[PDB]
Amino acid sequence: DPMVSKGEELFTGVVPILVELDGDVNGHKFSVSGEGEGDATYGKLTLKFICTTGKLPVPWPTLVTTFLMCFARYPDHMKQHDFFKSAMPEGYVQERTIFFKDDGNYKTRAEVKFEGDTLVNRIELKGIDFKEDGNILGHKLEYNYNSHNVYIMADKQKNGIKVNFKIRHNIEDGSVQLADHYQQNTPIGDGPVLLPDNHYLSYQSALSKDPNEKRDHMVLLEFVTAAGIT
Secondary structure (H helix, E strand, O other): OHHHHHHHHHHOOOEEEEEEEEEEEOOEEEEEEEEEEEEOOOOEEEEEEEEOOOOOOOOHHHHOOOOOHHHOEOOHHHHHHOHHHHOOOOOEEEEEEEEEOOOOEEEEEEEEEEEOOEEEEEEEEEEEOOOOOOOOOOOOEOOOOOOEEEEEEEEHHHOEEEEEEEEEEEEOOOOEEEEEEEEEEEEOOOOOOOOOOOEEEEEEEEEEOOOOOOOOEEEEEEEEEEEOOO
């Protein structure tokens, strides 16, 4: 399939990754820079994020999902369903509303595309209606992350895909902060894309710190694999 060969050609080895996010959550403005590499043959991501404006005013775990579906390992029998690679190199826009249960919301807009050999994710994030002493502004979430599935469907009207999914963040008292994710992706190009049958991505995420790093930061290890089409 020449379409599959094109995206697979861009993704076949280790691809350097750059991430830039501009955020404002209840008027708390902040910037984040991330670097690493993705290796889509194995669905593997290795990233480090740095808050470059001092203290991150929200818990690192709340940003993990905002911070590269093009790096998913699609099994060979599903490669006709990989919308994300198919939109490259021109890229795609990924938009979300994240609803924090009993708290505020993030609205995000990201453009994902190549700049030469570097795979780039430029993000803008706006959070509103957060509670001052709630779990996000209050920094009450544990520095960890559970496994989830992400359900992908075609959105034929937007020449793209819709995604919905729930993340449960661990709260330091043993309870859970539900983050309800609604997502839409659309190509940047006017080029053709692969519109998928219903399927899901399985995510595994592990958070850490760099013991030499004094800035506010997050090391992210992610594995991502498509499934649900036998």
